[PDB]
Amino acid sequence: PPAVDFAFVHSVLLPDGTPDVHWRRANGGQKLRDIMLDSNIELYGPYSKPLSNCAGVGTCATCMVEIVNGKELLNPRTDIEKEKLKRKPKNWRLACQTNVGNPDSTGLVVIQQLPEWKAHEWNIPKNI
Amino acid sequence: LLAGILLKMGAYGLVRINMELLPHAHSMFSPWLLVVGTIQIIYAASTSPGQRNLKKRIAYSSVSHMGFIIIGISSITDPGLNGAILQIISHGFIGAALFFLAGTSYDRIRLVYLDEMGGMAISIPKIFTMFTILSMASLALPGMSGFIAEFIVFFGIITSQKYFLISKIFIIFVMAIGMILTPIYLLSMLRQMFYGYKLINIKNFSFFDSGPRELFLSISILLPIIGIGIYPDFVLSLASDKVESILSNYFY
Amino acid sequence: AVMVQQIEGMRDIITEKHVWHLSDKAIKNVYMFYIMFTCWGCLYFGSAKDPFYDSEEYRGDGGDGTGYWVYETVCISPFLILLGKKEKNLEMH
Amino acid sequence: MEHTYQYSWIIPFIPLPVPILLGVGLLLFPTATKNLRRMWTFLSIFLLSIVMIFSIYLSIQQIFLSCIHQNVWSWTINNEFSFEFGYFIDPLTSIMSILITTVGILVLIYSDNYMSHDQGYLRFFAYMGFFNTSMLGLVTSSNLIQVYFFWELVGMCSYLLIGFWFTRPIAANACQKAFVTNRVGDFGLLLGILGLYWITGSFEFQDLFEIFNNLILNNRVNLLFLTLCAFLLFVGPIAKSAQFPLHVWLPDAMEGPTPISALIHAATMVAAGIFLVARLLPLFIVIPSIMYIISLIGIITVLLGATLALAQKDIKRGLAYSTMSQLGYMMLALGMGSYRSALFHLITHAYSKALLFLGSGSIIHSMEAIVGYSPDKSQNMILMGGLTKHVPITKTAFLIGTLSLCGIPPLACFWSKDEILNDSLLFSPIFAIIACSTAGLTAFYMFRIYLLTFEGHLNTYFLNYSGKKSGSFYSLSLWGKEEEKKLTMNNTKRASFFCNKTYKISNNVRNQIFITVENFGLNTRTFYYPHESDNTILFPMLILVLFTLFIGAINQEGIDFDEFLRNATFSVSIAFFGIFIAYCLYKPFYSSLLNLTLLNSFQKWNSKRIHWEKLINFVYNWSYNRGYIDSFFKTSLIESIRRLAKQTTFFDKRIIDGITNGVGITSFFVGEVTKYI
Amino acid sequence: GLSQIEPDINEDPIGQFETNSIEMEDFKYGYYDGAHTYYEGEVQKGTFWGAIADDIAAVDQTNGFQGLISCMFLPAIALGMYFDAPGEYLFIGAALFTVVFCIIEMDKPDQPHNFEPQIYKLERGARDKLINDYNTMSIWDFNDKYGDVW
């Protein structure tokens, strides 16, 4: 079946000092929030309580996720991600406004959840 | 003095050679001078947010505050004309000190428009506080002479024998929109020119504050405003009797 | 001064009504004292070290005390550098 | 009574010494008076304590003898003016005087340390002393002239206090809005008090109460004009008490300090909008349609105050919307004619929500040590998390305050709301069941505010989220000498170096080699925990706890001064229901007193999150767009005025200065033409 | 200010109405606004009289006599009432004070900030109007750069 390969590196490093990769399988592209919630990975963080976030529409800047190796199969920034966050390293997208594509999709997007409250910088190779 | 005392001849003149020399014609023309002044307050309070300039804002502010004098003159009442004379003196002090502070702010900052000239409160705090107090006096704020002026003129309207309630309601409404629009432009000026932080102005400028001379200027023009806001009869008591000698020519 | 006033709704009122006034002469006297204070300040603070309009910030660049000295200066110093540039081109750059 | 009321003219002007000495000190000798940094503080507190003592004695003499003293003087005597500036010491004045003086003293004591790390700190107390003077003159006010005087002076002090941190532009927008909103209210107040001088010719309260009892039986006065004048007279209170139209100034007034968030509201100034209506009730019950207007405004802004605070991520904004709801409860109680229950609700609210605001400031200054100074962090209620372990006194203070707002009966203040609903439910069907629903919502969001801050894990040093705390803790590895000399610069560990290969897919490895360089440990390793605030921040909170516990038992003295258990258990049922909806969500599983067998079925019944993915979505959209009313006003009221200003300065500069300049252009042109022809 | 070169035009005319302040994204709270500065410990003494007289001495061109009369003038007019009621004596004395102050303000120092802007070239100490009565130095024509170094 068409399976998109997520990674979902956690922000907190393990006690070993190495990151943890979880490799969620969830099929197709509808919404990265609904994928991370259906497949049960920590998206919000302390905003995971019910009314502590806008729950999908994009009015808060809470479900922001740093995505690297993700220039391949995404929707572009929908001017809510371009406005609700304005000064970020540009690898950070809101999971409920972004979309990883259509059902017939395969890819290796790696999406560091909770970029706020992190210790690492990811050293993305310079574009162009 | 162009706004302090030169603007008041013409307001005082409408009292001398129009109000007590041509009374039966002023009784014909004051109904329209009233509409003119009521439109003038709103017009000159709505043009002032239109001005990027700092000093033209206060010039239109003077055009706006002269509307209450036009209204008190066209109010055939003792309260109306006493409020007109009191507003002559009050706006004399206010506009004088405001133009003084705007000129010193231009000399310190060397910027004119409010789009530029962001936060300069930490740079010139003495100018900031004196400009704020005198904007409050321009605001018809109680404790300042502007309030009692821009209230006695209202009281001369609502206690007018010339006009009727169908007109008094409209006139008071359009007059008191002026005191919503006057906060808008005065505090827009204050938040544009003083409230903020400019990252390129951190320490390398370190402008000079208000020297003791300029501080004395502003304080010396403030103290009559405060003294007339707390006790208006420093200005009413020297005119009110004469005002009756005006209005005795009007009622019969 | 003391008056008891009956009102149906709430309570009784014990109004006092100290009708007073500063008086015609005292008003003249406070005008007098404030004008004398204005004299004192106009002379003394006029004889104070005005720190802004003394230094090379104001008096250095231009500093005549006008409001057009900035604009005529930044309209003249272009002309002065243009004249010095013509003088430099007069002697082979 | 004989001579103590002759000296009733000082309770306004006793604080005014220290702002007068500060406005001539900080403006002329700022270094010298800022050298006396802490002495002006104690002077202000001592003068406010003098006024507290005098107001307490006046309240004692009010409850002893049933009389009202109106020691009026003469301001100006020229023509019809005959102005006075007297002091209408009635039961309501005495309430307002104690309510101003006590909370002002405690907030001054609070600001002694809240603002001790402030650079401009004495001007704050200049503003506060002038604010207390202005409000004490507002409530001690015989005529609408002095009321109006001190109304606009309160607006001034609100502007200055909200824009106290003038450097930050958000406070600039806040203070400009606050004063503009207060003046949209004061517009109404002015052309209402002038309408009353038309209908009555009074400028006094002694005459108005004796005229309006029989005025409406005459013929010249139009009843439409009377209700119009009364609505405009109420528009002032709409702005000061943050009612539905002019409510936008309050949730944006949090950009100033927290002490002013305790004194501007839950205190003197929003109490002024309730004071004016309570003072003009003798001429609002007579006018037919204004009372329904006041009830409707209150009942609209109890749910606009309630549906707003459900999802405010900030602590101070949530408390401000809660204040906006309780002031609507008071305006509703005045809309019911209940002259006494509104004021008791005001007293208990102003001693409870002020306590909550002082607790919020103590929470905040405990949180600055964690997240530094950032209102998007140091006030963000979500990452406040868990503070019961660290700050217990502030926990007890905030808990007592929030339980006083929810209407807890034994150890809190339920009886105010009990009288509210007892006098409300047998009046109208519209303004009763929705008031109870908003009371349940009040319980919910206030306990959410309590739980997200205090009960739970810290949510900022939490080791499931905060990687910095993890990197600071594990200073050594779990292997000692093995697997590395230490590792920083861990690469893309997609295979984990486990000899794993991929099946038929798009790609496994590529030219993407990204070194996930981690941070270090054993550096700035302290990361101190939030310790309790100083003792002079606790002492105001303790006194306010003593108040709101002492106020909860106030043979009654509602008549001297100015379905019982079934309604009680019903109101407690809806309040406990809101409490329970907050508890089952925000109380964590390891500390909740509920059974795990039920808490798991809660999420099992709501694991879909599709019907909640619209309800929670709409509630958060409501709370974040601020009911869309701020957007509507900043699109159609201030942007409308800005379009109108550009239009009018166009008309001035182009086509009425165009004529004045065209005279000269035409003179030049005809001169050059008749020179060359 | 000076702007010897022509300044750069800003391509972003930020707005007719909103202020020129930095956004909250870049605003370091506490340190900028002074809400968390002023840690007591770097403060100084001078309790309200060692800093008032310091400020009076900071801004003053008054000598022993001019200045003493300035300190004793307003107390004299303040005791013009509440001790007596002279009348015209107060105004005659105030005019005498003003005129003697103005005669004194023909100061022996001339303080070159008093002079025209065109005077500020260099070496203006050699110019001495302070002692030289009837200066007779045609430099105020202000149309040509004469060498006044003699």
Ligand code: FES
């Ligand atoms: S949840 Fe509010 S932005 Fe995605």
